[PDB]
Structure 1
Amino acid sequence: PRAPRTYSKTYSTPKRPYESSRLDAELKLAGEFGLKNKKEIYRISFQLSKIRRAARDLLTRDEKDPKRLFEGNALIRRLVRVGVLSEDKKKLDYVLALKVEDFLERRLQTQVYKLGLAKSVHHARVLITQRHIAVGKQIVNIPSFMVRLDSEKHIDFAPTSPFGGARPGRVARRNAARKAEASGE
C-alpha cells in the first residue's frame, strides 16, 4: 500500500543479433562518437523509433484535424528545441527523416569535442565524467546529456575544476610540494 512509482525500460533489442550490415553500422557509430556498448545505440534507436512512429500516425490524419495540429506542433517544437531538427525544415514531414546520427551529434560528449576543448572524443568523455565541464554553471558529469539549442553557448570549464581556474588539483600539488620540499622546505 502506497501508490506505485512507475518505470519502463528505455532500450530494446533489435530483430537479430547478427546481420552483418547491422554489425558494421553499429561499429561505425560506436567508434565514431566514442560510445561504450550496444545499449547506447539501441536506446537511441528506441527513442527515434518512438518519435518516427508517432509522427507517422499523425500523418494518417487530415490537415486541420485538431489532434494532428496540436500534437504535431508539440513534437516539432520539441525536436527543434533539442536541435535535432533544423529551424527552416519545420513541417511534420521532415521528421520522417532524422537518422540516428542526428541524435548522437547533440550528445554532450560530441558537443564538447566539436567545441574544440577536448582534443578527441574519448578525452571528452573523460573530461565529462571527471567533474570538469559545466553546461549552465551546473557541473554536468553525464556524457549522454542531450544538449539543447541554447545551452550550447554556455558549455565551458567548470569553475571548480583545475582547468576552470581554481586550484591545481591532486597530483600537481603533490609534485609541487615534493619539488619545493626536496630543494628547500
Structure 2
Amino acid sequence: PRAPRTYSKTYSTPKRPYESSRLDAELKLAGEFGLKNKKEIYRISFQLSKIRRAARDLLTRDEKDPKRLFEGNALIRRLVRVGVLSEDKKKLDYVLALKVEDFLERRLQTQVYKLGLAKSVHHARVLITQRHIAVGKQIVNIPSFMVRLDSEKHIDFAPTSPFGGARPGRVARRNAARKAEASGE
C-alpha cells in the first residue's frame, strides 16, 4: 500500500483538574484576548514546553560545541522574526524566561485591534472570520495567524470587501432597492 501519512497531537491537558488558582488565571486570559476555549490556551503552553526543553538541553553542552552554536542560533533567529523575543534579549538564557502572554500578543486577532481597524478584540475576531482583512495581497481568515515583524506594515482591508472599496453588501443592497421601489411608486 501507499506509505503512511504522518500526524501529531498539538496540545496537552493539565494534570490537576480543579485547582482554583489556575482556573481564575485562565479565565483572565480568555477575557483579555477574546479566546473561545481553554484548548486555545493549552496549545500555547504546549508549544512553549517544547521550546524550553530544547534550550534546556543545549545549555548542558560546552560553549563552542559546534551543535550548540548551530542549533542555538537558529532557535533565537526564529523567535526574533515573529517578535516574541526582543532583539535586546538575544541570548539563550533569556529564552527560558518567556511566558504565555508573549505569544498571545502576536496573534492576528490582537494585532488588528492594536492598529485601529477594530474597536474591541471581539469586534476584531468577527472581521477576520468574515473575510475583511488582508495581509499584503492575501486574504487571511484565521485568527491565530502569527504576524511576522515585516508583515505589520501590510495589514489592511481586503480589496474585495466593503470598507475596502467594493460594492455594498447583500443587506445594504436589498434595503436600497425596496426603498427605491416604494419611492419609485
Interval of TM-score (by shorter of Structure 1 and Structure 2): over 0.9
**Shift of residue 98, structure 1, vs aligned partner:** 1.1
Runs of 4+ in 1 over 4 A off after TM superposition: none
TM-score (norm 2): 0.97
Superposed displacement of residue 41, structure 1: 0.2
| Cα distance between partner residues in 2 of 1:18 and 1:134 | 41
Gaps in structure 1 of 5+ consecutive residues? none
How big is the shift at 1:42? 0.2
1:62, distance to aligned residue in structure 2 (A): 1.6
Aligned residues: 185
TM-score between both structures, scaled by the size of structure 1: 0.97
Which digits, 9 at most, give the CA deviation of each residue in 1:61-88, with x for residues without a partner?
1210111111110100000001100112
Q: Which moved more, 1:67-76 or 1:14-23?
A: 14-23
Deviation digits for residues 140-183 of structure 1, max 9, x if unmatched?
Answer: 00000011111111110011111111111111111111111210
Distance 2:136 2:4 in 1: 34
Q: Which residue of 2 aligns with 1:86?
A: 86
For 2:19 and 2:152, the matched residues in 1 are separated by 37
SS in 1 for 2:149: coil
Distance 1:55 1:176 in 2: 61
1:133 CA displacement: 0.1
Q: Report the CA distance between 1:29 and its aligned residue.
A: 0.7
After TM superposition, give the deviation of residue 22 of structure 1 in Å.
1.0
Work out the CA distance in 2 between the residues paired with 1:66 and 1:14. 36
Structure 2: give runs of 5+ residues left out of the alignment.
none
Shift of 1:25: 1.0
